[PDB]
Amino acid sequence: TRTAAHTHIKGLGLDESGVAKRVEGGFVGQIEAREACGVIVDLIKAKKMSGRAILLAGGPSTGKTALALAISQELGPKVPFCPLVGSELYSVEVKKTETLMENFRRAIGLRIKETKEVYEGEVTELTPEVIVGLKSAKGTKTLRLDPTIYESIQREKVSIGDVIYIEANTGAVKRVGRSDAYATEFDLETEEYVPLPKGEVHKKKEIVQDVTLHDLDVANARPQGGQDVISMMGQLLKPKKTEITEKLRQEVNKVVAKYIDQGVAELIPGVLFIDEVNMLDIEIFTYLNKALESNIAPVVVLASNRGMTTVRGTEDVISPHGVPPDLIDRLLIVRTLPYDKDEIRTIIERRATVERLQVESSALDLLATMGTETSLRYALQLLAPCGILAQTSNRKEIVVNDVNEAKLLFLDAKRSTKILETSANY
Template sequence: MNTFSKKLERDGIHSHVLKKDTLDLLNQKNYKEALLNIVNLLKLNKSGQTFLIRGPSGCGKTALIADLHKEQYLINSISAVELQSFNLSKAEAVTQAVRKSIRLRIKEIIKVIEGEITNLTSSKLSLKTLDMESTFEIGDKMLQEIQKEKIVVGDVVRIIKERGKIIKLGISASKMDSEFIGDILSVPCPEGEMFKTIEDVQLMTLHDIDCLNNKTHGYLGIYNGETGEISSEVRKEVNKRVKKWILEEKVVLERGLLIIDNVQILHKDYFYLFNNSIEFTFDPVILMIENFTDTLQSSTGLLSSAFVINVDQINDNDLKDVIRAHIETENVDFDSNVLDYLNDLALSYGINYAINIIDLYVVKSLKQANTKIALEEVKTLVSLFLDVNRACDTN
C-alpha cells in the first residue's frame, strides 16, 4: 500500500474525539465515567437500562460514544432519521431495531477437514498435514466458495463439509516470502489427522432468527435487508424456541447496546413503542442521544425511566486543542493563524465542519505534495464547501 493510500484511511466522521487523550481535552470526565458504567452493564450482560445523553450540537456526544465500538460487544447504531425512513410501520421498525441488538452465541460440535492445499483443480483438491496427504473431489458449490475466498495452493484451510463452507486460515509458513504484503497471516502446516472435531461458535441476532423463520422473505432478508413486516406469531415462536435453547444450555443470550442518535426528532409514539417492545428477558441496553431541545416528551414511559447524562459545550481553549490534535495526527505543518481560523470555523459552524475542512485539505495536499496548511487555500475550501445553514441561506 503506497503512502497516498495509507493516508486516505479515514478514522470516520466523528474521529475528532478518538485521538489521544481527547476525552480529557474536552473535559468530559463525567461523561467518560458514565460510558464506562454502560460498558460494565454489557460485560455483566445486564438488561433493562435506558440512558439519554443530552447536550448542545457539536459537543462530541455521538463522537465520544464511537469509542464504544472498540469493545467486543454487539453495538447497533441507528439514527432517528433512519428509523423513520424504513419502509415499515413504526411498530415493526422499532421491534427490528431492538431485536437486532440482542444476539445468541450458539455453540455446537462440528466435524472439519484441515490441511495445506498442495494441488487445486476445478474438480479436485489435495490437502496435506505433516503426517498425511489426501485428495478430495469438489463440486460446483465448493468451487464457488474457493473462488470467492481467493484460495490458492499454499493456503491452509478448514473445510466444513456439511455446510459446504471453506475457511482460509492463512498461508503456510513454508510458502511465505518477502514478496507477500499486507495483513496476511502465516500459519504452520497442521499436524496429525486431517479430520477433526471442533467446537464452533456462531453469532446470530434475534432478528436474524426471525428472518430465517419468516416464510415471506426467508433467510434472504438477512442479506438484502428487505424483511417486510414479520408477524407476531413468528416472533412468539422464536422467543419460545430461544428460551428452550437457553434452558438446555445450547445458546447464551447476549444483550447488546442499541444507540439511537438525534432522538429529538422522533414522534412520542416511537418512545411508547420502544417501551412496549422491550421484554423482561429479551431487552438490550438503550442509549439515546439528543441535541438540547424543548420538543422531547420526557413524560413518555421510556424517557421517564431513563438515566440522563448531560454533556457540556466545549469551551474555546478545549476546542482549539482538539483541532490541533487532529491536525498533528495528519502529519502536516500549520501556522497559528490557520489554527485560529479553524477554531473560528468550529465556533461558527460546528466542530464537525472544521474537521471535515481539514480532511478535505489533507486529501488535496497529498496530491500536490504539500506539507504545510496554507490559510488562503483553507479559505478557498470554505467558500466551495458550505455548511448546511449557509447553504440554506444562499437559496
C-alpha cells in the same frame, strides 16, 4: 488509506476508577458525558440487569455520536453495538414495531456451538431409484440422496471424475470440480482439476458459529438450505421478512432456553442506538413506552437535542429534546456542555495529526480563532482544504494566505445568510 472524521477516537481513557484523561484517544473535555458513559460501560460489563435506557443531550459537535462510537469501540468485537436512526424504523413491507423487535432480537448476542459435517470426495457411482460414492483421500463411502437432493445432484452435472462439497447437516451440495487425478484428459481441459479431499468423506468439525435471535428466527421462518432445488423454492416463495408474531416468539424463547441450558452456549447483551428522536412520531413513542415495560428489551441509547419544540406526531406536546413527557420522566438525562476555546484548539490539533497535517503553531491558533468565531465544524472542515491549497500553492505549512483563501472561498452559514438579504433573485 482513508479517514472519515473518526478513527481518531480510540477509547474513553477511563483509569482503574473509571476516570478518563483530559485529551486521550480522541477526547476533549465533557467530563460529565465521559463519566456517565463510563458508568454505563461498567453497568453493561456487569452483564446482570437489562431493560434500562438513557439519552445524552448536547448541541452539534458536542461529542454525542463521538461518545457513542467511543463506547462501541470500548465494548469490543463480540458484543455488538446497534446503530440506527429514526429514519430506519420506517420500513416498507413490515410494520415499524416489528422492525423494532427485529432490531431488539438481533441485538443480543448468543454464543452457541452447533455441529456441521461435510461429505467431500470423488464420486464413484450413482444409482437412480440415491448413491453418490464420494471417494476422499482415504475413504470411499456411498450416501443415499433423498429425491430432492438427488435432483440437486443431477443438476450439478457430477460424473465420474468429480468432487463435491456436500454438507451433512444442511444437506446442500457444492461441487468442488473435476478430479485432479484425471488431469490426463485434455491438455486444455476447461474444468478445474481438484484432487481427492483429505480425511474421510464424512469430515466432522467442531464449529463456534454463533446465532443472533433474528438469525434462528429466519432459520425456521424462511429456511435457507440453499443449493438444493427445494431449498430454492423455499427461499423463493417467501424470500422476504414475514411478520413474526408472539407465538413464534414464545417458541423461539423456549428453543433458545433449552439450547442455552444444554450447557455450551451462553448469552451476551448488546447496545442499540437512536439519533434525533425529535423526528419520531407519537405512535412509535407511545408503543415503545409500553415496550420497555418488559423483560427482554435490551439497552438502547438516545441522542437528541431540541428546545421548546412540538413533538413530531403531535401538535401540542411541547417538551425539550422533542421527547414526549412520559418518556422523559422514564429516561435518564446525560448533560453535555458547549466546547471552549482550548477545546477547539486541541480538537483542530488532533484532527490535523490524524490527517497527517503538521500544522504549525500560528496556523493552528488562527484556525482555532475561526473555530471560536463562527462554529467548530466550519474550522474543522477547512483542515484538508487548507493543506491541499498550500500543496497547490507550494507550501508545506499553512500560511495565513491559505486560510484567508479558504475563508473567502468556502463560506459559512453566516456569510451566506448575509449575502441572502441583498439579492434581486433567490
